Structure formats: C-alpha cells, structure tokens
C-alpha cells in the first residue's frame, strides 16, 4: 500500500564464468553492476526486490575478480550498470535512482515494436508528440519487412519508439502504404515517409541516424548523457508559454540542420537542474535558454529578465543565429 | 555537468531549544527529520548539499534527545520529515527520494500565489488542466481581498495552485470581475465562480474543502497518502486512449458527488506501481481501473482483457455504478 | 489465383562460414538442406519462391564442401532438412512435399505461446481436442513464470501447443489459478494441473516428457518418425464410428501407462498409408488396428472382417491386453 | 516403413489406338496425362508406383502424337490429367501433388454409393457434416429406384457423397420412408426430403444441381477450381471461434439463395493460401473473409483487425449484405 | 473626485487579548493607537476610512484598560501610534496628519525589497539620489543570500530603501557581481561595495548602521525625530542655488566622519519650519544653516544676510569647521 | 522642537462691518472662513497659532450672521476659505490641512515677482522646470513696464511664478532684451519670448491665459480643483522611468493644442490618490495614465500590466490619439 522498503534479502548475485551463459537465457534482461558505494548497492537491491518476479536478473561483476567476464562483455566504466538483452549490451546512463531504473528496465523488457490494431488508437498515437516515433504497415509479424523493422527497433531500444500495424484500415488512417514506414520528429504533426520502400534494416538504421538530432527534443531520464539547452516548466503558465515559443521556432527551422534545441523540464529532473544551477549560476526554474560548452562547462544565456514579457519566436531565432555564427561561449 | 554525488560534508545539523527560534527566521523553510536508516540519512544529506545556497535549513530532531522540541512541534510519526514554513507545519508524505524531495521543497519555498500579468500567459494558464486551480482578480497586493486569498493559498500549499492578476485586461480574458475568484476542477475547461464575492479567507478555505475531491484527478509525487484508482500511461497510445475515456466519464458525472477517480500514470510512479503489482496481482502498466479497500488492501478490477478494444465511457460508467451500489470488494 | 508453379529463380543459396552468422539474425528461420535429388531440390525451390517475403532463409550446405559448417551445426543425415530458429535446431522428418513443408515452417515461425485474451476464445480452446495442449495464467509477458513457460514452449515447438492468458476472467473460465499450468491429453476433456506451482522451465519440460505418450494420439504430417497403430477415416461413417470406439478405450485406460495408440487418418496421409498397404498386406483404408515391429516391420492385426459389426471397446481392450501380454508379433 | 521414393521403373505407358479399348476394361480407372514438366512426370510416376497393385492404369497421350486418341476423348487443356471410369471422363483439377492425387483416385475407384447397414453407423453418419450428403432407403441393390440413385451418384462422383440403406431399422432412425432420399446441406443438422418419391435419375440430378451452392461449404483438395471466401484455421482457437460464427450466419440465411460462402482452412491448403497471400496482400492465416473477382483477382476484405474481438454473426451478415448490394469490388 | 471627508463610521476597534493574535495575521499591518485628543482620533478615523480595503487594521489600546496588552507589546509613549508588521514594531514619529500617515503605511505595507528587472529602470535608479539606497544581485528570491538581504531590509523599513536584481544584464549595468551589494550615500553618484561578499544579515545590518549618518541627507516626513541643520527651498532659485552649495561641501568631506548635515526643505515641512521660526527667531524660509542644541534648543546660525551673494562651499566649510572645533552654541 | 499642538487660545475672530476695513489694511493677508465642522475649525486655529506673528489675520464670517459682509465680499461656497490680499480675493481650493494651508499663505504673502540679481542664481532658475515661469528684464522697479509685469503677476498669484531682473549681465545670460518677457512651459528648456515688447498688463495676462494649459504639468497642493491624468511616483525607479516617458511625449506634441496631461505624484497627494483608488478601481501607486470624465467620474485607463515593460513614448502617443479621437470614456 505505501512505499516499498528494502527487506534485507540479497538478490544481487555475483556472476562467474560457466554460470554466465545459463542466466542469459533464463532471463529477458540481465542487470550487471560493474563493481563507500553503499548508495548504488542499496538502490540496486531495492529495484531487485521490487522486480523479483519479473524476468530480470541482477548480478554484480567485480572489476578485479571477474575481470575475465568483464573483459568478455566489454565493461569500461567502473561503477556503471550494463543491461544485457539477448545479443545486445545497454549501458544505463540515467540517474542512479530507483524510479528511473525501474522505468528504464520495464521499457527495455518489452517488445521493441508496439502493435497498433485499432482505429481509436491512431488518434492517441497522433497526439503523442514528445518523442521521435517510427510507424510501419506490414502484412504480418512473419514478413521479412516486419523483421527488418523489428531488428532496427531493437538497435535503438528504448530511446526511439517503433510502432507497427498489420491492418489496412489503421494504415489508411495513418496514410501508410504496404511496407512503408513514416518517421515523426518531436512536436511536428506531419511525418516523413522513408524513401524507396520496402526497407532493409540497414536502410532504416541509416535513416534514423541521420534524423536523430531534431530541431527540438525533450530530455528523458533514461536516454541522457555546441549544445543549446532550454529550460521550461510545462506545469507553470510561464514555462508553458515559453515552451510554445520553442515549438514555434522548431517549425520555422525544419530546413536548418545545425539547429538542435534540448528542452529540459525541471519538474522531470529536479535534482539535476538544481545541481546545474550551482554550475551555471542562473535560475533554471524559470524560463531560460543557453548554449553550454561540453568540455569547460562555460555557458552563455539569453537575456530573459522579465517572464511577463518573454521573447517572441523571432527574437529567440535571432539570438540562436548569433550563437551559431559566434556571439559568445 | 553530470549527476551530483554526496561529498561527505554533514550539513544536517541537530537542532536544540534556544537554538530553535533563531533558525526559523534565518530560513524560508526548515526541514526537520524526526530521528539502519542510512538510506533516509543519505538522501537528506544529498538534498542538503544540492540546495545549500537556498534559504532552506536541514536539521534532525532525535526522538529521545530533543523530545522537548519534538513535543513543542507535534512530531507523531518517527522517521517522518516535517517542513516548517513560518507558522505552518507540513509533513512530507511523498517518496523519500532526492528528486521528489527537491521538487517538493522548491514548490513550498515560493510564494503561494503566482501572479499573471500578461495576456499571453492566460492562454497557457487555460491549457494547464491537470490540477485544481484557483485564480482571482484584485486591485493590488495591498488589498484586504488579496490578503484573504493569499492566506487561503498558504493553507493549501503546495497541493492546490493559486493564481492572481491585478490587471483589467488579463481579468477580462479570464472573465473575472473585481475581487472574484474562479475555481477550476482538473480536466474541465469551465471554471466555477465562488459565490458572494468579495471573500474572506474562511469563505475561500471552506469552498475549496467542499470541492477538494473532483471527479478525476491525477496523482502527484508530492501530495499523496472507497477508493477508485485508474492506471494509464499517457506516453503510450493505449494508456492515452484510456485516459481520454476517463476524461469523458469525468465530464458526464460532474453532478455525482460520490464519484472521485484517482488517475495514476505509472511513468510518474514506476517504483510504487511495480510494488503495487505484487499486492494487487494485476499488470498495472497497461490500462486498468479498480476499487481498493483502504484497510485490507483488497481489490476488484474492471475486466479490460483486450487493449485493442478498451471499454467505452458508458461501459466504464456502468462498472462504476455497480461498484458504488455493491458489485464486489 | 490457381496453383503456384516454380518460376526458375534460384533462391536456395549456398551458405559458407563468415557468411553464416549474418543470415541467422537476418531471418526468423533458416532452412538448411544438407546436400538425382532433383525432386527435393524442386520442392525446396517452390517453397522458397512461395515464402520469399516471409522472414525465412533457404540455404544448402554440401556434405563435402561446407563440411566445416555441417560439423559446426551437427548434420548427421544427408538429404535431410534442418531448421534453425535462434539457438535451436529442428530436423524436419515429415513428408518432403510442398504442402507439408509450408505448414511446418509457418508453424515454427510464430511465437511458441498463443495468447488467449477473450472469453469467447475459451469455448473454442476447450473444443480443440486433437493434440496435447498446455495453458497457463500469468500476470504478464514480463513475468519470470511466463518466461519459464515460454522457454519450455520453445523446447517442444511445434509438436506440442502452448497457450497462455493474462486475464483473470479468462483464467476463471479455464479454472486456472495464478501461475498455474493445466495439461490437456488428447481426446480427454479434463486437464491435469501441474503440481507445485509456480514452475521453473525444467519442472515444465520434465512434466511434459513424462506425459508425452498419451493413451490415444493423432498423427500429424509435421511431427512423425511395441507400436499400436489404428487406422480410421474420420470423413467416413465407418471410420468415424471406429474412432469413437478408440476414444472410448482411451478414457477407460488413463491409468494404464503401457497403452499408447497412434491413430492415423488415411485422408491425412494418403500416400503413406497406401505405401504401408504394400508392406502390411492389409487394406488400411477401412478400420484396422495392429501392432507393428519397429525393426522388422512385422505386424499382427485385429480381425475386423465386417465393418457393419465393428468391435466394441471391451473387445478392443481385450485384444490390446493380449498383445501386451504376448498374443503374437 | 518410411516414405516411398520413386524407384525408376517407368509404369506410365503411352496409349495408342487399338491398344486403347483393351485397357479401359482391364482397369477400374484409367489415368491419362495429356502430354520442363519433369515435376508432373515424377509425381505421376510415384503415384503409379505406390498404386501399382490397384486396378488403376497410368498412361500418357501426347498432344502431337496421339492427337487421334486425344480428339477421341476430348482433351482440351494440355498438361491436364483426365480420369476415365467406365463411360465417364473426370478432369483432375486439384493440386498436382502425390497426396492429393492418391486421395482423389482412391475416392473415385470405389462404388459411388456407400451402404449403411448398422444402427451404430447412423450416429456417425449424422455427425459427419462437412459436405453435401444424400441418403436413400431402397428394397435392395436390384431395385430400379436404387439403380436411378446409383446412376445419379456416378454423375457427381467424387464431389458429392451418396449413401443408401436397405434396412428398415436404419431407415427408421434416419426418418426415411421407402424409396425416399434425404439431402443434407453442409453444417445443417436437418435434411431436405426430395419431393415426389420415387425418383428417376434425372429427378435426382436436377435436385442436386439446384442445391449445389449451399450457404457455407468447405473447400476440398479434390473438387476445387461474385465469390465470398472465408479463411479459418479450425485447429486454432481463433480460427475455430470464427468458424462457429460462419456456421451461425449459415443457419440464418438458409432462405437467401444469393449467399454462398466458401470456407478455406489454410491447414488443408498451406501452399495455395500462402500463394494467395501474395496476390491478395493480406494475412490469410488468421481469420479473414473477403469477396474476390473471378477475372481480375481484385478483392475487398472485411475489417477484422483484432482477433480477440471477432465480428458477431450480425456484423458478418451486415458486411455480406453490403457486398451483394454493392459496397466495393 | 474631491477630497475625502470622514463619514462617521467607527472603524478604529478596541483590541483585547485573545482577540489579539487573530487580527495580527488577518492583516499585513496593525495600527495601534495607545489611548481632548479628538484631533488624533479624527485623523486616525479618516485614514482608516480611506484605507478600509487595504490589508491594514486600525485598533486602539487604552493605557488603563488593556494595560495587559500594552505591556505585552511594549508601549511607552502614550498618545503614540505603533505599527505592527509580522514580528516587528514600528513607532510612528512623523507629523500626526492624514497625508503623512497614509504615505507611511503604504510605504510599510509593501515588500521591503524592490526588484529591478529592466535595463531602462537602472537609469532611473541611478538618478534617484535623495536617500540612502542599497542594491544587490542575487540568483533568485530563493537564495540564502537574498534572504539575508531581505531580512536586513525588513530591519530598516521604511527608512532605508533596498533594491535587488536577479538579472545578469541589469547587474552588469550596475557593476554588481553575484551576491554583491552596493551602498549609495545620498547625493553621491558612486556607490560603496560592501566588503567580503557574500553577506549574512548581521554583516549587512552592521555595515548600514556604520554608514547611517552621511555627509548630507534630506529630512522625510516619515523618518524624523551636535545637530547641523540647513534650510533650502528647492523650488526657489535661491534655495536651489544654496542646495547646490551644500551638495558641493558634501562631496568634499566624504572623509570627515564628524560631518552630518540635515537638509530640510520648508516646502516639505511648512508647519514644522514655521513653528521652528518662533523657537529659533530666524527666517527659515530663505537659505540658512545652523547648529542646534538637542536639549536646550539653543542655536547659532551662519550669517547669510544677502541671498544674492550666498556663501561659497569653502566659506560654508570654514564655518562648519569653526562650529565643530568650538565657535559658539 | 517637536510638532506644534494647538494651545486653546481662540485667535480666529469674528469680523463685522465697520470693523472690516480696518483689519484689511492692518494685515498683508486676511483669511476668511465662511461659517460638526470641528475639523476645519481646529486646522484653522492651529494655522492661526503657528502664524500669529506673521502679517496675516484669521477671521470667520457666519453665513446667517454677517450675510451683509458675505454679500459684500461675494462668498458663494459655504465651508470655504477665502484669502483677501489688497483688492484681490482668492478662494483656497486645496486640501484643508495645516501643511497645505501654511504653504499656501506663505506663498501668497510674498511679493508676486521674485527678483534675480546674481548670475549664479540663473543656473538654478534654469534647472527649476516643474512649473510655468515668466521672467522679464526691466530698468528698475519704478519702470512702467515692470509695473505692468508686477500687476500681471498679482493676477495669477500664487499659481504661476513671475521673476524679474534689473541687471544687464543676468539678462544677457537669460537672453533677455530690455523690457522683454520670456515664458517657460513646464519640462521644456527653451522659453517662448512674448511678442511685440514692451507689454501692457492686458497683453501679459492674455498671453498667459492662452498658454495656461501646457502639454505636461505637475499638480500642486495649492492650485488644484476631457481630462488626461498620469500617476507617477518620482521617488520610485518605476515611476521615475514613466515620468521620463511622459516628458518625452510632451516634447513631441508642443504643436498639439488639444494635449494637456496632468501628472500627479502620489507621494505629493497620498490621501487624495488613495481616495481616488476607491473611485477609479485601479492601483494609482504604480504607473498609470487615464482619461477621467469631469461629471460622471467614469474613467478609462491605458493598459500598463507590467512595470518592467512600460510603454514607449510612441505607444503612449498612440493611446492618447485614440482617446481624443474616441476610443472610450
Ligand atoms: Cl537476456
Ligand atoms: Cl531512489
Ligand atoms: Cl504491442
Ligand atoms: Cl496490438
Ligand atoms: Cl501478425
Ligand atoms: Cl497480421
Ligand atoms: Cl533483418
Ligand atoms: Cl521502441
Ligand atoms: Cl499499399
Ligand atoms: Cl545544440
Ligand atoms: Cl544545434
Ligand atoms: Cl533558483
Ligand atoms: Cl510571469
Ligand atoms: Cl521558516
Ligand atoms: Cl534518490
Ligand atoms: Cl508570481
Ligand atoms: Cl507577474
Ligand atoms: Cl500589486
Ligand atoms: Cl497592482
Ligand atoms: Cl486574511
Ligand atoms: Cl499554490
Ligand atoms: Cl468588476
Ligand atoms: Cl474513490
Ligand atoms: Cl468515489
Ligand atoms: Cl507487469
Ligand atoms: Cl493495444
Ligand atoms: Cl534464426
Ligand atoms: Cl509437393
Ligand atoms: Cl498469440
Ligand atoms: Cl491475444
Ligand atoms: Cl503482457
Ligand atoms: Cl498483462
Ligand atoms: Cl526460464
Ligand atoms: Cl506451441
Ligand atoms: Cl489465484
Ligand atoms: Cl504402442
Ligand atoms: Cl503402448
Ligand atoms: Cl459398413
Ligand atoms: Cl475404366
Ligand atoms: Cl508431392
Ligand atoms: Cl458400401
Ligand atoms: Cl454395408
Ligand atoms: Cl441388396
Ligand atoms: Cl437388401
Ligand atoms: Cl437409372
Ligand atoms: Cl459418392
Ligand atoms: Cl415407407
Ligand atoms: Cl460467393
Ligand atoms: Cl453468394
Ligand atoms: Cl502472413
Ligand atoms: Cl501584521
Ligand atoms: Cl490632516
Ligand atoms: Cl518589486
Ligand atoms: Cl520586478
Ligand atoms: Cl526569483
Ligand atoms: Cl530569478
Ligand atoms: Cl537571514
Ligand atoms: Cl525598503
Ligand atoms: Cl559575478
Ligand atoms: Cl550634525
Ligand atoms: Cl556632524
Ligand atoms: Cl490685505
Ligand atoms: Cl493637518
Ligand atoms: Cl525678490
Ligand atoms: Cl534680488
Ligand atoms: Cl529697482
Ligand atoms: Cl534697478
Ligand atoms: Cl499696469
Ligand atoms: Cl508669483
Ligand atoms: Cl536690449
Ligand atoms: Cl486633458
Ligand atoms: Cl488634452
Ligand atoms: Cl493599491
Ligand atoms: Cl518594475
């Protein structure tokens, strides 16, 4: 009923060789912790307790002990959590917290393609606009074209969402022809149809990698970790009004490939944004947009002194253009 | 740049008497931890480090030691975190996690009334529909009617959001007369104007307490902790389509006072929902709606076997009516 | 519109090493033909043409040439067709004919667990009685207990059909408790509940291997290749009446473990039964039951001279008992 | 013991004139192949080897050589197989495959009337519901009324099954009066008694030709080759549930003469259905129903996107009515 | 439209105990009158009528009756007006007149820190030179450094004006670094930066108390009540020219701590200056400067016989130096 | 030393006829009060006490008693205070308060022409810009042209300030020729030279009456009592910045005769502005500008919702133009 508390049972096992390959096929997902770190230990134990009847294994691989198995799997960063799913290895880069870890694993454990089989689900599909989506129409799950699409979906999981229908009426409402795949940029209503259908998996992966930096995109707690970053609380009328300005500049520079704004909602990342306030010396809980140096953590911020008089989209665009050309960094 | 890690400095001080009343006026907020609890200790230390230059004090009051001060402040639950703000005491009931705690404190530290002074902010105000809102039009901050509204806002902080304008043109767009206050239920576009303006604070608090259980409301990580609960992932086309059905039943029973649905998005509470799956023995990460016994944690769930054929709003309403009348518990 | 004819295009590729592991993950199924055999060549080419847009690869591995890859995969019988599905190897033992091969591959390519999500599907499930079935009730696809059941299903695919539901109402109609699995013998209405739920995969595989020889079972064109064999044309009133007698002896000796009758419908295997007529020197297109020596192909047949006076179930049972004890072989 | 393989002996003789009429009375059945066709050659040779001690002759008539004999017998389609039985000529239109050919010939070689002489056989007769049946009660084989019935049976062989009894007690259980004939439509329990008994052969043939297109009928591998076609796997709980819906619409429109649904089980025709998937661009291995143009191979399919929510019989009937009236083609 | 006249309604309530603490939090400001005084009664009633919809309470505490509450609040001078604001008590020492009282209360009721958020407001800030100002640059209202500054502002309210910005561009124009505070003496353009930023509240209060007696300062009707006093009508060319001489002597003795001139404009205090003319026996409505004994009200005045030949700044400075050394008193 | 309190002595005498004309020449000024009015009584008594050794008489003329003398002097409004100065009668229309009354009388009692005899006084003259000024250059006080100027000055006293010099060097710095008079509009640096010097008194009075409504003018407590009114606190950075915008619109429409803005500083009129807030239902203590109906007290106000983004002078001018043309009233 209330919140779970860790019961003391140690479920995070230590995985050796020979013991290795048995547990990879016992589970859907293998969670590997590569080696004062009682905080990460206890978060991992609580996630393992809460998910104990899911098809997820929790193991730890010591840097000095199972260096054999760590070399066998390619574990560079010590203190990092790696997820194995079949033949694939996923390094978790999100916040090492129980909520974020649970959400990440439950995203990874499901099939990479979500099937839409109802016309009433298409309206809901079209209104979900916060992430990159791909959707295709195939004859069935057995099709070689579905298989190529599913294999591409596995390559981007869980960061990019793939969808498919096998129904003519659903596909008609999505304006999809047979074996065609539409690509949806975030916060844009009109999809891009991938050229020269039907597609191999290499054709799908290459298209998605070209279009992986859209004009505006929303940070997620899973996928994270020169750089234009905008801060807007969607739950606040100020931040929401600013978000609508950012959406307007996104639809004006779909032609511009050198424009990629990362929108961070502070309500989605309250600890991270508060920590960044100490580094950037600015109030990031009111509307801001800046460019950050990846190395030196230097920053320059657009002047938004008055949240009752936010910049228009043209004023944002002019500041953006001065930054790419060279205003300051 | 990356995520904050706790540096070892102990900022959570132990607060005695005589030392007490000085620190209540040094800070905007006083965070009091009432007494194997290294998990809550380390979360509290990391929040204290991240917020160290905010006007927030972090203290701990031992149950056996400062039982004098604990009796002076009324600390019942040991292991609970209490927030002092001026004359007010707030027990934190959310998840004891760094993200949720930071967001709660930054919500509490700000002024309880958000001032809207721009017509472009009204459109954004009207689109924010996920929580109960109140908005009033007053002559200025000095008005006795604003003061009554601000004092009512302080009484419900941070669970219910209060807004005010001092501008005639903003108020005209909100259809607010002078000293009038509109009450917005979640997921309903049309506000309720509080009768017999101008209002005392007791008149505002009494109105809000009558209307505190609306037909549909969304759980928040701050405010939480017989009971109809619906589970819907808004980020998923299935969960979004179900959410739209729940919104439709909400607008059909605004007359019915015995109808209060609590919508929980599992993406907002991934640890809690996964833990509840073990208690309710049902997949709560796909659309579900049930009634839960507060004491015994018994539950009965509507049959939604096929997410490609969700119930219509009429079928939901009939199941709801059978539950209130007596179908099972 | 009419029947497909082979167009001349050679799609059955020759698979070498290094080229090997790429195509195993390009396809759902890999069809490997291990080396005057123009008949098997042309059947394989026509199946490859008809299924060319399914996720199925057709290759050939020469016994002398890719003896490296043939040793790598364990190909004993030359002239045999092996199906690779993930980590699994399936030797096709059925009739080398286009109909039987297509049906086998389309059975293998689908998910080994068929999900039942509708109460109207349970009635149809219960009426399907010609093969061994297993059905379980699990919380979701993510459950470790579903995963054990799915892994057991993969081990017996496509010879034994596995089913699952995630719905309480469906499970109630099947009389299934949570994580319980029911085992259905052919031509018996009442399932056997597998003891000591929840089950590991080794517990499921061991139960199924004990119960793999039921009292009566129907030969299939996929699964085939001391032995009591009964011949009955279900489409003929004579053969149907005899089939009903065989079903009656099956329900009388559920206790007897040394009783396993193989029913062959000649309309399902017209070429094979006609060929066996030349070996057994008896008309197998009218009701017959016999015991066949596996080595010497000797046989002894029950006297059924008059199909207007078929044996009763007691007369069949007495003949069966004389055969196990020792009447003749 | 295993499957037959063709031994090399050439039994398919070439038939000239003068040599012709001798072999027509040597055999029960004469199999005539009218002229890169090594596939049909080798299938015919294997059937001839397997059936070599049956009263069946296998000959080939070249289009250019014995054009005399081909004109004498009326051989239009080259590459077609014609069966001679007494005075009758049967063109085989099924799949040119060894299983289908063996089953066809063994159906044709037997007497066209199956005699039922046991009351226990009547129960089995009544449960066999998948094809059109006729059954009559006569005094004996010598009766002129049996002879008319037998001659009608020969005219429809092997596509329509004829049955007779000479026993009063059997006939009483079938509710047959002396010289009366009952006509059974597929999937309907209640027969139609042919009016104005006793019957001449022309009276029987004319009745059967009027009732040759029933409301629902199952395709057979023998008899095959505007058109409503339904696809349902009886071995699958989904396909079985759909089949039961099709049976329900059949019993609701026994009055409607313009309603004739052809049910194809894909497990009976796996190669043909897979080939049709490429022509109709739809998954025919899950429940579907469509109308197909005989000329252009155009098709329009009922929307069945969700096999957990199949159409009811009323929804099927409404779609059927829209198709006959004119929805699309 | 015209001037307000008192309507007769008695709003100045008498405040008892238990009734006390409720009204302190009902209002922003509590106006307490501590006990032939119909003049002060009627002024207080007119102010209470004019401000009746402001968050200001008007009460009276009788010296003999609520001597309990008067001892509880520390009311020494009878006939005095005390203002309560939160935890603070302010004795009004100005002229007991409706204009002065209204202006005082409206100064006290507002937030002690005025926020500057526009670059165009900085020019206006810099030109306002008649009073002591403090201005700081902080990250936000939530900052512990803003809180210390706000708490210091509350301690000096309304006599010393505090300002803050949260904007980098505004702060750059003010030459303010982060958490730095500048102190502006009256009639001097260049601020003093308070040393060793960031500041606690005790550090700010101690700095302001050292610098509370600047070289020249202008009397206000709020703040008033050995002593060098200068009289100059700024609205008169004579008085304005003299004021410019006084400003010039102020910039020449910023080093001299024993020099504090109080400038009184008679147009700001016409009743008080006219009354002082009877005590000092000199025309104070033309330029004068004198030193007044605080006890005995003795005075000695600089000889300014000819307002067409005012003293230069050097002549003023020499007279000032003779007075501090000892010329007369 | 402190503030004067009324001592009880009754100096406000009642003036009869025959007693009348003696006291008009005993005093410089005669203060006549024309008849529950204990407030005006006590203010008048305190002013009379404070000014008792000035050449000012304080009398009262009852409406019913000395109606003879009231008709002789032309006293319309009862409850009004009339000032006699020689042959002139001045009705006091200001706030009936001791400060305002003292300042008014001390303004009236002095000579209407202020003589400037020093070059250092000219700089101070030129910087005094808040009121209409006239300045002339004459040979001496004996000149007929000075006498005409002095007589015109007496006609406008004390509302319009007149100045004169008799010095060539002072006049050269003012750019004044002999007997020339310059007219200074408020807040404009450049004077208007009155045409066709030398002037009669009727020529001066007629010029001043044409130019008595300048583009911007500041309300005074003396002179007060369709109408554009602007509210700006000069002591506040917001109000000061707005005042500078109003000055800028004043210099852009010196051509426009139908533009006369009345600037009211609320710090100069705190009681009156607070009272007007109740009539105009707007916060007049922050920057506002409106047009007020003289009769109905209706008002329409420019939208200034955001004091961090005040209107520019062009936006003010456009709103002004819409008001004169007809936007609303
Ligand atoms: Cl895995
Ligand atoms: Cl956590
Ligand atoms: Cl899905
Ligand atoms: Cl689906
Ligand atoms: Cl599919
Ligand atoms: Cl499909
Ligand atoms: Cl692929
Ligand atoms: Cl995905
Ligand atoms: Cl298409
Ligand atoms: Cl960027
Ligand atoms: Cl970019
Ligand atoms: Cl902040
Ligand atoms: Cl704002
Ligand atoms: Cl506090
Ligand atoms: Cl945490
Ligand atoms: Cl605000
Ligand atoms: Cl605001
Ligand atoms: Cl305000
Ligand atoms: Cl306001
Ligand atoms: Cl209040
Ligand atoms: Cl709030
Ligand atoms: Cl109103
Ligand atoms: Cl509820
Ligand atoms: Cl409820
Ligand atoms: Cl689940
Ligand atoms: Cl779905
Ligand atoms: Cl594979
Ligand atoms: Cl074949
Ligand atoms: Cl399934
Ligand atoms: Cl399903
Ligand atoms: Cl599931
Ligand atoms: Cl589920
Ligand atoms: Cl497993
Ligand atoms: Cl299976
Ligand atoms: Cl259960
Ligand atoms: Cl056996
Ligand atoms: Cl056996
Ligand atoms: Cl028989
Ligand atoms: Cl023949
Ligand atoms: Cl074949
Ligand atoms: Cl027979
Ligand atoms: Cl018979
Ligand atoms: Cl007979
Ligand atoms: Cl007979
Ligand atoms: Cl006949
Ligand atoms: Cl027949
Ligand atoms: Cl009869
Ligand atoms: Cl048809
Ligand atoms: Cl039809
Ligand atoms: Cl398919
Ligand atoms: Cl207060
Ligand atoms: Cl007053
Ligand atoms: Cl402010
Ligand atoms: Cl501000
Ligand atoms: Cl702030
Ligand atoms: Cl800020
Ligand atoms: Cl502080
Ligand atoms: Cl202040
Ligand atoms: Cl700085
Ligand atoms: Cl002094
Ligand atoms: Cl001094
Ligand atoms: Cl006079
Ligand atoms: Cl007064
Ligand atoms: Cl003068
Ligand atoms: Cl002079
Ligand atoms: Cl003179
Ligand atoms: Cl002169
Ligand atoms: Cl004159
Ligand atoms: Cl004057
Ligand atoms: Cl001149
Ligand atoms: Cl005007
Ligand atoms: Cl005007
Ligand atoms: Cl106000
Ligand atoms: Cl401002």
Swiss-Prot record, chains A, B, C, D, E, F:
Modification type Phosphotyrosine: residues: 240
Keyword terms of this UniProt record: Calcium, Disease variant, Glycoprotein, Metal-binding, Muscle protein, Phosphoprotein, Sarcoplasmic reticulum, Signal
Name this polypeptide is given: Calsequestrin-2
GO MF annotation terms: calcium ion binding; calcium ion sequestering activity; calcium-dependent protein binding; protein homodimerization activity
Major localization class: other
Associated pathology: Ventricular tachycardia, catecholaminergic polymorphic, 2: An arrhythmogenic disorder characterized by stress-induced, bidirectional ventricular tachycardia that may degenerate into cardiac arrest and cause sudden death. Patients present with recurrent syncope, seizures, or sudden death after physical activity or emotional stress. CPVT2 inheritance is autosomal recessive.
Glycoprotein keyword on record: yes
Organism of derivation: Homo sapiens (Human)
Function: Calsequestrin is a high-capacity, moderate affinity, calcium-binding protein and thus acts as an internal calcium store in muscle. Calcium ions are bound by clusters of acidic residues at the protein surface, especially at the interface between subunits. Can bind around 60 Ca(2+) ions. Regulates the release of lumenal Ca(2+) via the calcium release channel RYR2; this plays an important role in triggering muscle contraction. Plays a role in excitation-contraction coupling in the heart and in regulating the rate of heart beats.
Alphabetized Pfam families for the sequence: Calsequestrin (PF01216)
Similarity comment text for this entry: Belongs to the calsequestrin family.
Cited CDD domains: PDI_b'_Calsequestrin_C, PDI_b_Calsequestrin_middle, PDI_b_Calsequestrin_N
Protein's cellular compartments: Sarcoplasmic reticulum lumen
Glycosylation site list: 293
Post-translational modification: Phosphorylation in the C-terminus, probably by CK2, moderately increases calcium buffering capacity. N-glycosylated.
Keyword Iron appears in the UniProt entry: no
Effect of substituting residue 43 to M: Increases dimerization in the absence of calcium
One GO cellular component term noted in the UniProt record for this chain: sarcoplasmic reticulum membrane
Gene Ontology terms: biological process: cardiac muscle contraction; cellular response to caffeine; detection of calcium ion; intracellular calcium ion homeostasis; negative regulation of potassium ion transport; protein polymerization; Purkinje myocyte to ventricular cardiac muscle cell signaling; regulation of cardiac muscle contraction by regulation of the release of sequestered calcium ion
């Amino acid at each position: 009923l209330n919140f779970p508390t860790y019961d003391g049972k140690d479920r995070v096992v230590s995985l050796s060789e020979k013991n290795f390959k048995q547990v990879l096929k016992k589970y859907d997902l293998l969670c590997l912790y590569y080696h004062q770190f009682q905080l990460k230990e206890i978060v991992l134990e609580l996630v393992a307790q809460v998910l104990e009847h899911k098809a997820i294994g929790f193991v730890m691989v010591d840097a000095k002990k199972e260096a054999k198995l760590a070399k066998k799997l390619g574990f560079d960063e010590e203190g990092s959590l790696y997820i194995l799913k079949g033949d694939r290895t996923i390094e978790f880069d999100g916040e090492f917290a129980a909520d974020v870890l649970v959400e990440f694993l439950l995203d990874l454990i499901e099939d990479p393609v979500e099937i839409i089989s109802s016309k009433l689900e298409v309206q809901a599909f079209e209104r979900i606009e916060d992430y990159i989506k791909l959707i295709g129409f195939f004859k069935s799950e057995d099709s070689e074209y579905y298989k190529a699409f599913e294999e591409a979906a596995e390559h981007f999981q869980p960061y990019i969402k793939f969808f498919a229908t096998f129904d003519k009426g659903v596909a008609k409402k999505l304006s999809l022809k047979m074996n065609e795949v539409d690509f949806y940029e975030p916060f844009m209503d009109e999809p891009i149809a991938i050229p020269n259908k039907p597609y191999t998996e290499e054709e799908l992966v290459e298209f998605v990698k070209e279009h992986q930096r859209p004009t505006l995109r929303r940070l997620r707690p899973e996928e994270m970790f020169i750089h234009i970053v905008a801060f807007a609380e969607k739950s606040d009328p100020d931040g929401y009004e600013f978000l609508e300005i950012l959406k307007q500049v996104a639809r004006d520079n779909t032609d511009n490939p050198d424009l990629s704004i990362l929108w961070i909602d502070p309500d989605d990342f309250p600890l991270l944004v508060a920590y960044w306030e100490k580094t950037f010396k600015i109030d990031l809980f009111r509307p801001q947009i800046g460019v950050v140096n990846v190395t030196d953590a230097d920053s320059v911020w657009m002047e938004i002194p008055d949240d009752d008089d936010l910049p228009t989209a043209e004023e944002l665009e002019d500041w953006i253009e001065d930054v790419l050309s060279g205003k300051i960094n």
